[PDB]
């Protein structure tokens, strides 16, 4: 992102639940249950003459909504947010769009969706 | 040898966006790559059908996506918006509708209907 | 042992100003305390900005409004996303060719 | 609207059908 | 291979001509869709022989009815 993107305030989910990526407020950073779990399992007297371990540029607290900034990217355009303008673009035909190259078609999703959104929530 | 030669498929490996082409330039102790990417800007919403269970009989796109403004139905492709009329030449077959519940009802165009007359 | 010492210095730049900021790393001590350490020479806020200079433990600082150094919890992004529908998306209609630039190092000098 | 177009005829499978199917 | 209606064959456009054993369809390798095979999913380029092992079928004539 060339523009500091974003994260939704409305949980209009109704068949999905976009709330494990888009964070719960339970933790002080923007790192909820899923991001409480991919960091917290990544498991001095040394420094008596100078030898530390350097920290890189982006430590733990820009990317827990910069990855929302890409979550405000890669579903909000699909790809095209990145080098220019972007506004809203939805998902459950993006749950068919990139599937319009996989060999299979658009309304493999749309119709048995109220099973398949549950199965894609079984993919949650 | 994968951005300048050839047209790759690898995003964040040939610049930023869908890689189109590549212009290399020399540099003091360096190599500089220009990149051309197809990154569109302006969009909308659109509204779909599930399908067209036309003769009691469903319909699939070939390579793209059915949409509508809300009344007129349009077949189009994935990345650029050229709405077209849903023909039989944009559909194939594979077997019965309503073991897949959740379709809507519509028509498909079929260009023979003026031809013999 | 007592003098558990690591001492750090912050400046926005010679060409901009000369007021500085001093970071002490390892003391439970304007003064502002971080897990990175005990910081003196800036002001904490509640605001949100990109990082300019890393401090440690999720702290960065910059030079804002007269004007001075302010350090802060470093921002992460703004707010909205997809208005999801179970049956919608659009195309992106109008497009823009653009050019970015990437740099790679070829070779250093063959010194014997 | 497009540059460099040439002007030619396109064959049709359907034009030899109406003379066959009468 | 083909539906052979009018002395000329109806070809794999980008489907391919499938069956349960009695009645006939034309599928892809990916998902599931009923239709009626008509004149405008079918197309010709000559007779019914040159590829190996063809089958037989007619093509419907949907402008024959609506003149009566």
From Swiss-Prot, chain D:
Domain of life: Viruses
Residues linked to a glycan: 7
Function statement: Subunit of the fusion protein that is processed upon entry into the host cell. Mediates fusion of the virion and cellular membranes by functioning as a class I viral fusion protein. Contains a viral fusion peptide that is unmasked after S2 cleavage. This cleavage can occur at the cell membrane by host TMPRSS2 or during endocytosis by host CSTL. In either case, this triggers an extensive and irreversible conformational change that leads to fusion of the viral envelope with the cellular cytoplasmic membrane, releasing viral genomic RNA into the host cell cytoplasm.
Protein name: Spike protein S2'
